[PDB]
Design a protein around this ligand. Structure first.
Ligand SMILES: CC(=O)N[C@H]1[C@H]([C@H](O)[C@H](O)CO)O[C@@](O)(C(=O)O)C[C@@H]1O
Ligand SMILES: [Ca+2]
Ligand SMILES: [Ca+2]
Length: 183
């Protein structure tokens, strides 16, 4: 494989560390499809954004790939007051106590798949699936979704071993094998 963006070896134990990838948005802003593969260790059980790409200074205008105590999912929201929507695809899963590996796969005209620890944990069949191209972005973060001020930013605590972003779907086979390294 070959990523358009590669982040790794990150420790996020408090609010301020906390990885600002805003300066990289031009790489992701036009993606209608793609894949995110990330290896991580969570410390809390609340909804935590592993990666949040968001507008503003807005409340509900964001992409969020999140993990929970018992869930994995993503949101793509808008906001703006014209063509507004709230997408939410998630799955009940059981994580390793320690290190976990997930992948979100988006394929334009097909839909979405979520992988975790070498299993396909969710299939979304949607020929009209949307991705980053569908919202305006002015903020990017690994470890939270940047939101207005009174809205929950899904603060992550723990470590991120790696975070690879691709501009193409990427085979199920590869994704099963990479995430499967933490089966
Ligand atoms: C992944 C998920 O379910 N997100 C939802 C969150 C969480 O349930 C709470 O923030 C948990 O405290 O709640 C909302 O009201 C919000 O904050 O915008 C709606 C949003 O879709
Ligand atoms: Ca853990
Ligand atoms: Ca903020």
């Amino acid at each position: 494989v070959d990523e358009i963006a590669n982040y790794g070896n990150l420790k996020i134990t408090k609010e301020e560390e906390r990885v600002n990838i805003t300066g990289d948005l031009e790489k992701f802003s036009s993606l209608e499809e793609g894949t995110i593969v990330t290896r991580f260790n969570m410390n809390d059980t609340s909804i935590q954004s592993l990666i949040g790409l968001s507008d503003g200074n807005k409340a509900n205008n964001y992409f969020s790939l999140y993990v929970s105590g018992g869930k994995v999912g993503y949101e793509l929201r808008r906001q703006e007051g014209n063509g507004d929507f709230n997408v939410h695809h998630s799955a009940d899963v059981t994580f390793n106590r320690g290190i976990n590996t997930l992948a979100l796969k988006i394929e334009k005209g097909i839909g979405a798949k979520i992988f975790l620890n070498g299993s396909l944990v969710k299939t979304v069949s949607d020929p009209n699936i949307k991705f980053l191209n569908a919202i305006n972005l002015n903020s990017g973060f690994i470890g939270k979704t940047d939101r207005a001020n009174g809205y929950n930013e899904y603060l992550f605590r723990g470590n991120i071993d790696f975070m690879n972003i691709y501009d193409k779907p990427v085979s199920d086979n590869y994704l099963l094998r990479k995430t499967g390294e933490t089966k």
